[PDB]
Ligand binder design. Structure first.
Ligand SMILES: Cc1ncc(COP(=O)(O)O)c(/C=N\OC[C@H]2NC(=O)[C@@H](CON)NC2=O)c1O
Ligand SMILES: Cc1ncc(COP(=O)(O)O)c(/C=N\OC[C@H]2NC(=O)[C@@H](CON)NC2=O)c1O
Lengths: 424, 424
């Protein structure tokens, strides 16, 4: 049924000028991904002219969906005045005020062009502040390509060092790994390295290890350990921020020293932010002589990304937050019902507007749970829906009851087709 | 004469929500920088309503100046179709084709959201390709905040390891430094580390050590060493690309294995690129199983940055390149004349549309050459001109001979005022 000839033709061009026709590993699919030309509200139109409802929204970036009229106005108007400057602008101050207001701990903020840069600068800030070499991170949690955090970032629960080919021992030996939601197991590792730990880097709701939230007991253990050891508690909320109106740590009853943010804080334009207590952020302060930590970047605080940010936070009202949370609860409930009726032991995790289908037992005709989930991703595409190829999805503010109802129909139909093709 | 009350008021707000009221170290000035609201062509209007000619252009990013109508049209149209997607787009393929066409060596390209990310991924690519730990870089050359390259990046010619506070020995010990344009001195260091060298990372025209080009003999020595040792030759042209129509290495008669690009390739929107021979870029290829080097990023190849790129390269014609080169030659000549007539021993370096005033002897009343150059930066601001506070500047395509003549008048006047205030 599904026609992808224009996607195939774009891929045939792409392989001549990009490695395997790819510029972003996460969006690749074999033998080629679906190419898209436009988005409007909750819907994306592919290069073959097929409109689908987007339930992943650029990996949870597009909290306001595609080309939101108020976002388009703010961004296009900013572009008309100048895309970037070698001088600060009013909108960087306005946006820093808007973001600082979202959480007590966001006292001082700095902007980057990506969550990847923001995580790197948060780690560098903790190292500059403490003058200690080691960082602790969660086993399996992903924090972007920065080499110190590109360690055990593949969804594995194992604590054994596993890094990208070529990442030197000099980097890998200074990143230690803790088990998510295991207070005793985490404190064993942290206490071993306490004298040398610059920071404990967590994601309070890491999707790669199942999109389960950090427990109160685990967050309390890490908070107490950081207070006692002087290690900086860094909450990487580039993905998980959106679960709470004041971010993920606040929802789960905890306080970070530094929070890393991105994605929804500008809802489509390149952004990252490091937001923390004044004392941790003081390493960046250049106003009292040379800063401990120089931090530049050609697009830092560029007025287009700042204008995108102001519009995104303005549209992200308590009412909008509550409504996408309701739709997320409805979507997760409907998926659990459909999986149960299909006779699968698969789970659905998530908070607020985030969800993940977690494939457990491989059904007949699939070599793995992951292969069955990829098949479900492709069947959902055929049935007019975009989700993640490992089960990640999210609600956007343009969605209503009708989009979630259509999703429920497509999900049940797609499960049926996946299972039937496995038994064929 | 100069009124900055609205800049002072923005700074008073900024210090409450940013460390020292700063989000980008390079744009800070004491006691506060001038804040700007808009740019049009070659001119920038500050928050106090003062229009000045911009001779630095967001640190040499804005080759087409501010809000170029053809750039604004292309970017606004892309924004209207969707700012970013979890799927590739036609414009990423079109832009990869356009950028690949600029140089024989740009066989495969990958896009990032910054030059900082692009340098990091080029280093990671060389480490993945060679499975060797060490990188060599130029003593004093700047390549962004990535910790492996944030070593000896401060304009010093000394080879002694000097890193940011907190950068661990594990990182710093794997970055070795070579003396710019010293073939024998460079080969001594490179031969010592040959078995363990993943890459030699150069900038062919590094501005921080004076904006002098790499010599044929030095480039030949490095090229021969990389061929013999298997180390990857990486040319970081994020700043220096614009000196040549095919980039900096090609202008100077040399070939890189991998080239890092940014700034002018999109001329205002967040971008970086890694471009190189297929074999070096193959570490990123995800089409024949798991890639050696995963490389994602929420804004990689986003259609707004791709559309900015297509428009920038379309406007960057051989004719535009030639004319801004003429204006650069005129500007450098006029500054040398003015410095000579003022009785200063200061030099003016640069190729094509780039220049740098290199302050040598401190005149009466200044503690350093750098302090005298900062005073000249402030006097030029008073006299209607933006340059860099350490002498960097560049031509934009909206400039004509009249803007360079106005600059020459302001430059001579500013030198006079700097010298008079020193003797006061
Ligand atoms: C916790 C966290 N920290 C940092 C980042 C990077 O932010 P970015 O540079 O703005 O994309 C991200 C961004 N994306 O991570 C997940 C995303 N990126 C990926 O590479 C894959 C998961 O790992 N291969 N799939 C995804 O959906 C993040 O989630
Ligand atoms: C050779 C080279 N490689 C990488 C980068 C970083 O690219 P970006 O993240 O897109 O800003 C750059 C970007 N800026 O470097 C210069 C610029 N950046 C700064 O941090 C300050 C201090 O450094 N020289 N002054 C500047 O003029 C670069 O020139």
């Amino acid at each position: 049924a599904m026609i992808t000839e224009k996607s195939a033709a774009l891929y045939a061009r792409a392989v001549e000028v990009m490695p395997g026709g790819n510029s972003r590993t996460a969006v690749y699919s074999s033998p080629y991904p679906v190419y898209v030309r436009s988005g409007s509200g909750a819907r994306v139109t592919d290069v073959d002219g097929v409109e689908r409802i987007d339930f992943l929204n650029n990996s949870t970036t597009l909290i306001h969906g595609h080309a939101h009229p108020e976002m388009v106005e703010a961004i296009a108007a900013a572009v008309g005045h100048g895309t970037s400057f070698g001088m600060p602008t009013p909108v960087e101050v306005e946006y820093a005020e808007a973001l600082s207001a979202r959480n007590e701990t966001f006292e001082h903020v700095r902007f980057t062009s990506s969550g990847t840069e923001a995580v790197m600068m948060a780690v560098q800030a903790a190292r500059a502040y403490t003058e200690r070499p080691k960082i602790a991170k969660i086993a399996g949690a992903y924090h972007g390509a920065y080499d110190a955090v590109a360690v055990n970032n593949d969804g594995s629960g194992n604590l054994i060092s596993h890094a990208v080919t070529g990442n030197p021992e000099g980097v890998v030996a200074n990143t230690v790994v803790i088990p998510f939601n295991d207070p005793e197991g985490s404190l064993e590792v942290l206490r071993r390295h306490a004298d040398d730990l610059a920071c404990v880097l967590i994601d309070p709701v890491p999707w790669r290890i199942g999109l389960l939230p950090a427990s109160k007991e685990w967050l309390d253990a890490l908070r107490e350990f950081c207070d006692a050891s002087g290690a900086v508690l860094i909450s990487d909320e580039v993905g998980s921020y959106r679960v709470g109106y004041h971010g993920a740590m606040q929802l789960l009853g905890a306080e970070a020293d530094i929070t890393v943010m991105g994605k929804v804080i500008a809802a489509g334009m390149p952004i990252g932010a490091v937001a923390g207590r004044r004392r941790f952020m003081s390493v960046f302060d250049p106003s009292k002589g040379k800063p401990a930590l120089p931090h530049s970047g050609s697009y830092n605080a560029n007025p287009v990304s700042m204008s995108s940010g102001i519009a995104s936070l303005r549209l992200l009202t308590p009412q909008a937050h509550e409504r996408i949370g309701q739709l997320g609860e409805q979507a997760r409930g409907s998926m659990r019902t459909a999986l149960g009726e299909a006779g699968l032991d698969w789970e659905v995790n998530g908070l607020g507007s985030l969800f993940r289908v977690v494939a457990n037992s491989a059904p007949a005709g699939y070599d793995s749970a992951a292969a069955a989930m990829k098949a479900l991703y492709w069947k959902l595409l055929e049935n007019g829906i975009h989700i993640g190829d490992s089960g990640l999805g999210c609600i956007s503010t343009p969605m209503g009851e009708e989009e979630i109802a259509e999703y429920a129909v497509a999900f049940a139909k797609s499960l049926g087709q996946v299972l039937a093709e496995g038994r064929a």
